Structures are given as structure tokens and as C-alpha cells.
Amino acid sequence: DEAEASKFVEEYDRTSQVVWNEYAEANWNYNTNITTETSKILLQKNMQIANHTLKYGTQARKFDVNQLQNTTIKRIIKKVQDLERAALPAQELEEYNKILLDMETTYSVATVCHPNGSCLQLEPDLTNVMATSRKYEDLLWAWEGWRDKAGRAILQFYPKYVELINQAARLNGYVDAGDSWRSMYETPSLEQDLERLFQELQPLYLNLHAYVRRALHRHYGAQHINLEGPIPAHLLGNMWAQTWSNIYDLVVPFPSAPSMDTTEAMLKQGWTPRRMFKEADDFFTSLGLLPVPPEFWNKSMLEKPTDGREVVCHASAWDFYNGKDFRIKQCTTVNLEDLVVAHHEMGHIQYFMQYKDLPVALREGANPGFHEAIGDVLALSVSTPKHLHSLNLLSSEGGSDEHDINFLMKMALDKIAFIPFSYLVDQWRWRVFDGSITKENYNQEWWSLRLKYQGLCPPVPRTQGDFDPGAKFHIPSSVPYIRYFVSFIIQFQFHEALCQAAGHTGPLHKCDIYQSKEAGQRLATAMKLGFSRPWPEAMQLITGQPNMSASAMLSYFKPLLDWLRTENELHGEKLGWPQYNWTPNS
Ligand SMILES: O=C(N[C@@H](Cc1ccccc1)P(=O)(O)C[C@@H](Cc1cc(-c2ccccc2)no1)C(=O)N[C@@H](Cc1ccc(O)cc1)C(=O)O)OCc1ccccc1
Ligand SMILES: *[C@@H]1O[C@H](CO[C@@H]2O[C@@H](C)[C@@H](O)[C@@H](O)[C@@H]2O)[C@@H](O[C@@H]2O[C@H](CO)[C@@H](O)[C@H](O)[C@H]2NC(C)=O)[C@H](O)[C@H]1NC(C)=O
Ligand SMILES: *[C@@H]1O[C@H](CO)[C@@H](O)[C@H](O)[C@H]1NC(C)=O
Ligand SMILES: [Cl-]
Ligand SMILES: [Cl-]
Ligand SMILES: [Zn+2]
């Protein structure tokens, strides 16, 4: 009955706090200090948490969920019935945990070396090469080398990973791991909804793609860019060509309206990783949102250790299920890109702090996209020329329609280009998980989607043994990706809603919500719900309506769409890549 059910969830919450806190501690210790010992302690703590998950999950399944009145209780129990990997038999669970460890370790310690020269790590060395080199061959060296070293090394693990994650999913009542991941949205129409949103961003993406392609043609040469074909994947300023704003210098709409070198500005003005996170902290509190506790400053890892010791650099935000202990682990570089990343990560921290008083079972985003969006929303305001000038990182850019188009381009290179990338990652993984793509076809099907959605081609033909997906963090780390597609759509809906609540008029892209208590209150009420209600309720609290919608993002970028159509038309661009079979000749 009802009494036994609420007693069970009370017990689950107390015991889970302790066990998850211990697990998080050991996971943190490994991530911030990769050694045999920390690896050993982590794999053992995996047994402890799996023990706990099994005890409570087993009990939870004995409840017939739909004989239960209270919906919150009903919700916690159905959630605890999913054992995740702890559903696996002992032998397989051991193997699965080791596979995950080996994949994440392989990715985070991989280096690319010059023969009898220096070896480069992904962060910051290879990231910098991809961002700043303008030499075709040097970009290719980094692009291919990273795949050769990280991607190829992951392949040995992946088929067994897929087998075991699917097995766990079936043991929890799903048909495969991709089914399990999609269920996080509790939205039957999810796939159709995402396809519709993607299609809505097509006019903008194709126009951006055509314009950038033309600019690359100008720089890298006619013999290396097909004006009617896909773009070589190593030329977009980013290892995965997922965000393109590092090639802003190659594509600036009005070079007569230069922008201040923001990296130079931050360096000269003595900016440090600590200052970057303090600025993000200030933006959150300016909205009437929560400051990070003193403990955050004590315990976080805000730059790469110089100890020589090895870490997982890929940025992350950590809840220790204390209601007290929250940490970021980021190998912060002093530049504008990492200032934005800091805001992204501080977004997750804010969410942790807002829902800290809920049962741990409900300590999640309304959906995973909500958790990813919070930090990015504030970052949209931080990124405005007006705000950056206030931080002394840009000079006065206001008024000028030239600076205005330039700013919109700078934003589109990231926000619009990322749409097809974020969409395709889990299109690939869902089909791996459902058995549509086998290990024979992993890489070929990845490039088929790279072509279909982003209109990119690999600069060097792929060969047997390549596994380019393994060269992207989220693949060996088994972190779902569709959350980021959702985030990019909804963060603009949030921006639009918060801006109108803040009383801002005129073009959406001119909005800066700094210090708006009205905007802060909307975000806080939504975040406080955690995972306690269907996500459309949190959507409603922020935006006044319950749907995901591209209209806000389209509205933000409307002036750029008009500019790009006019520009592309006057140059006679053919939108898309009708010569889709094109690959580099040399
Ligand atoms: O810490 C995370 N998640 C991190 C990933 C993760 C998850 C589990 C275990 C380990 C790690 P991230 O997404 O913050 C880590 C962030 C890092 C990051 C990079 C950049 C970036 C933007 C522009 C140019 C260059 C870089 N922006 O954010 C991430 O991966 N982002 C995706 C997607 C992305 C997001 C925002 C964005 O602007 C661009 C891309 C990526 O790097 O591919 O989740 C915390 C949490 C959430 C919900 C519940 C519990 C805990
Ligand atoms: C359904 O139950 C929720 C949860 O109740 C809490 O957790 C249970 C395990 C048990 O320990 C209860 O005594 C707890 O109150 C109720 O939501 C709570 O309601 C109170 C009072 O309004 C509120 O202050 C709390 O914040 C709520 N907690 C959560 C986690 O939402 C809810 O009222 C019940 N619904 C109905 C219709 O009775
Ligand atoms: C790294 O881990 C080892 C155990 O493997 C530990 O003794 C050492 O103190 C750790 N280093 C740091 C800097 O925490
Ligand atoms: Cl790739
Ligand atoms: Cl997700
Ligand atoms: Zn994130």
C-alpha cells in the first residue's frame, strides 16, 4: 500500500545520498589523478554502488507502480526499478566497468607526436592547432593524428561495450541502450519532434555552410574546395568541426569593422581561470541566483595540474549528493571560448544547487537538455558586444550595422553549425544500439551522416581499423549527445522569454539579461522542479508555453539569414552539396 511505498523511498533517499557521495568521491579522485591505485579504488566503489542499486532496485520492482496514489512516490519507485548497468550479472558487470574505464582512460591520455619531436595532448595543444593554424597540411596532421591515436585505440573496446550496454538495457525492460537513453525525455514523439526542429534550421545552416565554403575556397584554394561539394572536415577551427567560430578571421562579413583580440585582451589584463569562474559566479548572483559555496573554490580543479600527473581534461560539473559539495573540473585556458565553457559548467552547478533539497532520484534536469541549456543562456548575454565591452574585452562596437552582422556571424558559426553535428551523433549511436550499424560499418555510417547532415567530407580517405567516433569524448565516455541538440534549440527559447521578462525591446540578439531578477526567478522556479514533473511544465514556467520550438533561434538569427541569402545569391552559391560524392583529390 501507500505507507510501505513512501517508507521505501525515504530509505532509498538516505542510503543513496551516502553511497552516491562515496562513489562520486572515488570517481572524482580518478578523474583528477589517473593512476593504478585510483583506478582500482573506483572499480571497487563501482561494486559498492551496484550492490546498493541492486538491493533497492529489487525492492522497487516488487511494488506494482499503478496501484499507488501519490504521483511523486509513484515516480521515484518506477525510476528506482531501472537498475542501469547493475542489472548485469556479476561477471558481465565487472567486464563492463573495466571497458568503460579503459575507454575513458585511452581517450584522456592519448597523444599525437612528431617523429623524434614533441607529443601533443588534445587540451590544449591539438585544440590550439585546430583553432589557429591556417595551413592545410598542419591542420591535417592534427586531425588525422588525433583519429589515428584516439579513435583507432577505442575500436577494440566498442563492440563489447555495445553488447553489454544493450544487455543491461534489455534487462531493465528496454529494447536496446538507445531506447533507454531516449526514454530520459519521457516524450513518445521525441524522434519526430527532433527531426522537425532540425528541418526548420536547414535554411540557416545551408546558407551558413555555403558562405563559409566560399571563404575557405578563397583561403585554401580552388584545387582544395569544391563550391558544390562537402567541406573538408579539418578546416573549421575545431577538431570535430562541430562549432566553427575559430575561423571567424577567414569569414568576417565586414573586415573593415575589426574586433579586439579577446585572447590578447584577457592575457594582458591578467585574467586567470579563477577570475573567469568568478565572473560567471557574478552573472548568476546578479540574477538573484545562488553563489557557489566557499567549498567550491577549495575543492574544484580549475586548470590542468602542472604536477605532471594525468587527468581527464574534458570539462565537467560534479554533484557530490551532499547538498553542500559541488565542483568543476576543467583544464581552463585563458580565452573567450573557455570563458563561455566556464559559464556552461557553472550552469550545471546552479542546477545542482537549485534542486539540492529534492529526493536524489529527482535530482536531474527537467530533461537532460535543460541541464545543458542553463549555463549557455547566461553565456548568450555574456557574449554580446555590449557586455564584452563592459568586461574590457571588446572596444565599442554599438550602432554599426557592420559590427552587428559580424557579431551575428560570430554567433552563428557556433550556434547554427552545431545543429547538424549535435543531431547526428546519437542518430549514429541509436542505430549502433538497435543493431542497424554493425562493427563492419561503424565508420562508413558515421561519414554517411557527416555528409548527410553537416555536408562534410574527411580530408583523407578512411581505412579499415579507423573508428573516428572514438575520437570524440562522448563516445568512449558513454555520454548521451542529443541533450546538446535539445539545449541549442531551447536555450534560445529561454533567452527570448527571459529577455521579455527583463523588459528588453528590439532585436533579440541585442538582449543582455545581466542583473534581471525577473529572469532569475523564472530560471530558479524551473530548476527547483528538478526531475519531479514532466519537462513541459518547466518549459511552461520559463517560456509561457510547453513546446520545444525553433522560432526563437530563427528570430535571433533572422537579420543574418537575410544577409546570408543576399550574399550567397549575389555570388551564385548552390546551397547544399549536390556533388555529394566529392572528396579531396590531394
Ligand atoms: O558535467 C556534465 N557534463 C559534461 C560532459 C560529461 C558528462 C558526463 C561525464 C563526464 C563529462 P559537459 O556537457 O558539461 C562538458 C561540455 C564541455 C563544453 C565544451 C564546449 C565548447 C564550446 C565551444 C567551443 C569549444 C568547446 N562547451 O561545453 C560538453 O561536453 N559539451 C559538448 C557540447 C557542447 C555544449 C555547449 C556548447 O556551446 C558547444 C558544445 C561538447 O563539448 O561536445 O554533466 C553534469 C550533469 C548534468 C546533469 C545531471 C548530472 C550531472
Ligand atoms: C505526494 O508526496 C510528495 C512527497 O512527500 C514527501 O516525501 C514522502 C516520501 C514522505 O516522506 C512525505 O512525508 C514527504 O512530504 C508530497 O510532496 C511534498 O509536499 C509537501 C507539503 O506540501 C511539500 O512541502 C514538499 O516540498 C513536497 N515534497 C516533494 C518531494 O515534492 C505531495 O504533497 C504528495 N501529493 C499529494 C497529492 O498528497
Ligand atoms: C594521486 O594518487 C595517488 C594514489 O594513486 C595518491 O597517493 C596521490 O596523493 C595523488 N595525487 C594528488 C595530487 O592528489
Ligand atoms: Cl570525425
Ligand atoms: Cl540526452
Ligand atoms: Zn554540460
Swiss-Prot record:
Domain (Peptidase M2) ranges: 1-578
Q: List the disulfide bonds.
A: 113-119, 313-331, 499-511
What subcellular locations does the record give? Cell membrane; Cytoplasm
How is the protein modified post-translationally, according to the record? Answer: Phosphorylated on tyrosine residues on its extracellular part, promoting cleavage by secretase enzymes and formation of the soluble form (Angiotensin-converting enzyme, soluble form).
| Positions bearing the site annotation: Not glycosylated | 581
Q: In which tissues is this gene expressed?
A: Ubiquitously expressed, with highest levels in lung, kidney, heart, gastrointestinal system and prostate.
Positions that bind chloride 2: 147, 446, 450
Chain coiled-coil ranges: none
Induction: what does the entry report?
Up-regulated in failing heart.
| Annotated consequence of substituting residue 372 to V | Abolished dipeptidyl carboxypeptidase activity
Q: What is the effect of changing residue 345 to D?
A: Abolished peptidase activity, leading to increased levels of amyloid-beta
Lineage, top-rank taxon, reads Eukaryota
- According to the record, glycans are attached at 33, 51, 70, 116, 298, 547
Report residues binding chloride 3.
185, 483
Record-annotated site: Cleavage: 522-523
Impact of altering residue 483 to Q? Abolished dependence to chloride, leading to reduced peptidyl dipeptidase activity
Q: What is the effect of changing residue 522 to Q?
A: Does not prevent cleavage and secretion of the soluble form, suggesting that processing can take place at different sites
List the active-site residues: 345, 474
Chain residues that bind Zn(2+) 2? 344, 348, 372
Pathology linked to this chain's protein:
Ischemic stroke: A stroke is an acute neurologic event leading to death of neural tissue of the brain and resulting in loss of motor, sensory and/or cognitive function. Ischemic strokes, resulting from vascular occlusion, is considered to be a highly complex disease consisting of a group of heterogeneous disorders with multiple genetic and environmental risk factors. Renal tubular dysgenesis: Autosomal recessive severe disorder of renal tubular development characterized by persistent fetal anuria and perinatal death, probably due to pulmonary hypoplasia from early-onset oligohydramnios (the Potter phenotype).
Q: What else is known?
A: Inhibitors of ACE are commonly used to treat hypertension and some types of renal and cardiac dysfunction.
Q: How does it assemble?
A: Monomer and homodimer; homodimerizes following binding to an inhibitor. Interacts with calmodulin (CALM1, CALM2 or CALM3); interaction takes place in the cytoplasmic region and regulates phosphorylation and proteolytic cleavage.
Name the job this protein performs: Dipeptidyl carboxypeptidase that removes dipeptides from the C-terminus of a variety of circulating hormones, such as angiotensin I, bradykinin or enkephalins, thereby playing a key role in the regulation of blood pressure, electrolyte homeostasis or synaptic plasticity. Composed of two similar catalytic domains, each possessing a functional active site, with different selectivity for substrates.
What family is this?
Belongs to the peptidase M2 family.
Per its record, how is this protein called by name? Angiotensin-converting enzyme
Source organism? Homo sapiens (Human)
Its lineage reads: Eukaryota, Metazoa, Chordata, Craniata, Vertebrata
Gene, per the UniProt record: ACE
